DNA sequence: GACTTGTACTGGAACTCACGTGAACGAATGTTTTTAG
DNA sequence: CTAAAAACATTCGTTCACGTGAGTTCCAGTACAAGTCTAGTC
Ligand SMILES: Nc1ncnc2c1ncn2[C@H]1C[C@H](O)[C@@H](COP(=O)(O)NP(=O)(O)OP(=O)(O)O)O1
């Protein structure tokens with residue numbers, strides 16, 4: 001071989017037998033060294049009319065059969081060999097010659113504290129505006145987008161990270177791009193500063209006042225809270241009670257109030273029926289330090305005794321003199337406005353009580369502990385994918401008319417083929 | 429029935445009439461042979477390369 | 480608003496038909512050149 | 517010097533290979549319409 005430092009090996013697959021033979025003969029005539037069979041001595045390999053990626057597949061299948069420590073050859077194209085033959089010498093080598101984020105929120109854990117506070121707040125504001133406008137689907141999709149942004153392991157700094165995230169179309173992508181590029185988003189400020197949004201938010205916070213009533217008042221000329229008090233004849237009991245104790249209910253609750261209310265309710269249930277068990281559900285079970293209400297679940301480990309527990313406990317508490325509002329002044333649900341005496345005086349904080357047997361206990365806990373969006377997504381996934389119906393009472397199969405009761409909440413997730421998440425990871 | 433071509437008869441640069449050409453009499457030939465691999469009777473193709 | 484399912488349109492590709500170019504093969508027929516007697 | 521044989525030149529029919537234009541029909545893509553979005557109590 002004239003060039004001891006060069007060893008060229010061709011490839012049969014695409015070139016063909018005749019082309020390979022002709023090229024080998026020409027190279028041999030021009031003094032080159034061509035190896036009949038692939039070996040470690042080969043320093044360069046030439047393909048032809050083959051995509052780069054495919055060529056890599058050829059290299060790997062050859063690396064497994066070679067001893068370790070051998071320097072891999074350099075991939076080359078037929079253009080290199082033709083140029084070398086034409087110029088008479090080996091030409092220099094140049095560049096030319098050389099499961100994920102599931103859509104359903106039930107599959108992705110969502111910690112309470114995230115690194116996308118601003119974007120989530122903007123999406124929540126847009127969702128609230130859409131809900132006020134009366135479009136439930138817009139609210140749902142915006143909430144889903146906010147939840148998706150909330151579960152990101154790392155902060156989002158470039159738009160390229162939004163490609164794989166589901167529930168992210170033109171509108172949400174544009175909103176996030178505006179937020180990232182310029183900071184404050186024009187659309188968010190436009191919707192927020194709108195008087196309609198502010199007045200609707202003010203009215204909705206009133207207990208017993210929904211979106212429909214708020215819109216009806218808005219179109220009737222009612223714009224300020226005081227104006228509502230000027231006509232106390234078109235308000236039901238709920239609206240009157242909410243408006244009277246507006247300031248008291250506007251303040252977020254702390255954990256100490258939760259502890260005091262839990263102690264009071266535990267004493268009441270213990271005196272009413274012995275052996276009663278009360279579990280704290282809602283936002284406070286997910287790790288939240290602040291809330292809007294305190295939610296409990298009452299049950300008896302023994303089967304078939306909580307037939308009429310709630311009325312007795314409610315009337316006993318009313319006799320004690322703490323219930324400002326009772327939903328009904330046999331039921332297994334009620335919302336109230338307790339009269340909490342502060343140590344320094346008293347403030348009104350809402351409390352909700354719900355009863356359920358031991359058999360239905362895990363389902364009630366799951367339904368009353370998770371977030372609204374998480375519950376919606378879990379129910380949708382159960383109905384669509386697995387075809388089962390999930391509700392606060394139990395899991396039902398339309399095909400086989402048999403309940404799927406269980407002794408623990410872990411079994412509920414296990415049946416649906418879903419990884420278990422703690423209550424703190426069910427935030428939206 | 430098929431028209432070999434749709435052409436334009438031009439009596440003058442300004443006068444044009446569309447016409448169609450047909451072959452009422454066409455020679456008949458055997459269907460073209462197709463090459464087959466001997467071992468498996470699988471169709472093959474012919475590629476021409478100039479180098 | 481985002482996704483999923485179903486319906487309708489439609490511009491281009493595939494296929495077929497026909498013609499023209501270029502080549503090889505046999506086949507012939509004739510004509511020209513070389514060698515033997 | 518003459519005759520026989522070999523070689524060369526030209527023509528003709530056939531088959532094969534490719535390329536290119538035109539006409540007809542199928543199909544994969546794109547556009548758009550409509551439905552859905554959780555479940556229950558009071
Ligand atoms: N629309 C709905 N659909 C399904 N489930 C729902 C629901 N609304 C509530 N639940 C279930 C899931 C809810 O966790 C539970 C009641 O929770 P809340 O007291 O209404 N809101 P929270 O206390 O969690 O938070 P914050 O302190 O910010 O007000 O009932």
Ligand SMILES: [Mg+2]
Nearest residue numbers: 282293294295
């Ligand atoms: Mg609550």
